[PDB]
């Protein structure tokens, strides 16, 4: 009977770094997507495998809300079948994804003069992530032929890279807050339904 906690996801003061992307499980609640539909300020709102207009009338077993910050020209990677640093090493959606991706410019919240060094992405990895895999490890990356033995130095790099968001950057380089809603269509009873 309780409303789903979308406000805690969308309106959180800080979001996660994309390598350490945050997942809220949305369960046993009424999901009111009206405040999402009413906003004119989302730069991206795109669904996959679902009609995007009927969310207030649909029932799902569970909904997962994943959220993080990336830069604007990387939002294209938050979709099935993409490649690049984010899709390969940070947040991977499966090829037959069912859900919606919402994003908005967050330059006013996540940039600062001199640089915001709190938002990170994984720059180096030995293999691509599997869909919905999360890698928060900080093992030293061997870029050369000689092993690192856990020590940074020449040819041995910390795997995470700071975005350094600054508000005077071009829009493609500004931070964007992303929420990915994954819709679960199992055969168990529905526990997340819209108001109608």
């Amino acid at each position: 009977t309780n409303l789903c906690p979308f406000g805690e996801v969308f309106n959180a003061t800080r979001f996660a770094s994309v390598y350490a992307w945050n997942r809220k499980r949305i369960s046993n609640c009424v999901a009111d997507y009206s405040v999402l539909y009413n906003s004119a300020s989302f730069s991206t709102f795109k669904c996959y495998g679902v009609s995007p207009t009927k969310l207030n009338d649909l029932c799902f077993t569970n909904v997962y809300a994943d959220s993080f910050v990336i830069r604007g020209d990387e939002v294209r990677q938050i979709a099935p079948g993409q490649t690049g640093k984010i899709a390969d090493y940070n947040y991977k959606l499966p090829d037959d994804f069912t859900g919606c991706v919402i994003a908005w410019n967050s330059n006013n919240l996540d940039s600062k003069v001199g640089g915001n060094y709190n938002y990170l992405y994984r720059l180096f990895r030995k293999s691509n992530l599997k869909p919905f895999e999360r890698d928060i490890s900080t093992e030293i990356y061997q870029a050369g032929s000689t092993p690192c033995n856990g020590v940074e130095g020449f040819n041995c790099y910390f795997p995470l890279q700071s975005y350094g968001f600054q508000p005077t950057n071009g829009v493609g380089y500004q931070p964007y807050r992303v929420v990915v809603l994954s819709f679960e269509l199992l055969h168990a009873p529905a526990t997340v339904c819209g108001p109608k």
Partner: single-chain antibody, 232 residues
Framework: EVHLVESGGGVVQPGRSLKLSCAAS????????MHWVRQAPGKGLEWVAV????????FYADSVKGRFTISRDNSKNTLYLQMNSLRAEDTAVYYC?????????????????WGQGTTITVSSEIVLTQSPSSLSASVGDRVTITCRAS??????LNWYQQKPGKAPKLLIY???SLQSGVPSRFSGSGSGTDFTLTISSLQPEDFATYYC??????????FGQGTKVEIK
Amino acid sequence: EVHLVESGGGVVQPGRSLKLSCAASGFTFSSYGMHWVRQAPGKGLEWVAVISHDGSSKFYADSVKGRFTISRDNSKNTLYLQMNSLRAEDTAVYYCAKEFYDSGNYRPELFDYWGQGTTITVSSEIVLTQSPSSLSASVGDRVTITCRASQSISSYLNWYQQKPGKAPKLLIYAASSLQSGVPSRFSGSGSGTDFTLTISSLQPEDFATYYCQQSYSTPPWTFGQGTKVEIK
């Protein structure tokens, strides 16, 4: 018995405003989402806007965002498109289209029935590619039309027939399901990025332009560029 009648078109200068209307009958109007789709002279189909059955959800093509407003009055069974700040590349025939599934169905949506359109002249995403662009064949022949998607669209690929001068007609939905009233010679196959429409024995009334369109990732709903079929 579904009927859709657009009106409100005309010739206007750039920067002017124009309201289109679509009067619906023959179905329960308040149970269905509705779309506007347009077609510039000599060009293909371009999705414009969508509104949910109660008006609470609305999406727009990027080219019209901030200038067009989609609206509905379910008590009058009428759909509207308020077009402001009009401009030369808004010139097109505008069609209203009824959605295919009911309001509680999760499935990717598509264009069940279309009105005949109203014309506007303004005075002085997943990409689908079809092959071939045009072909000539004889009555009785097999015709094969391919549609490739830039990105996997699973099964959500639909086919429309557009006779010259007419509103488009849904032929196939969900890659291979036949729309009611469509003759058995039309069939569709494929999945992922690779789809085929086949007409097994071409008939005289089959000369038309055939369009694929994907419903997997929306908005925007997107269309192939069209395949023109002629009867020699």
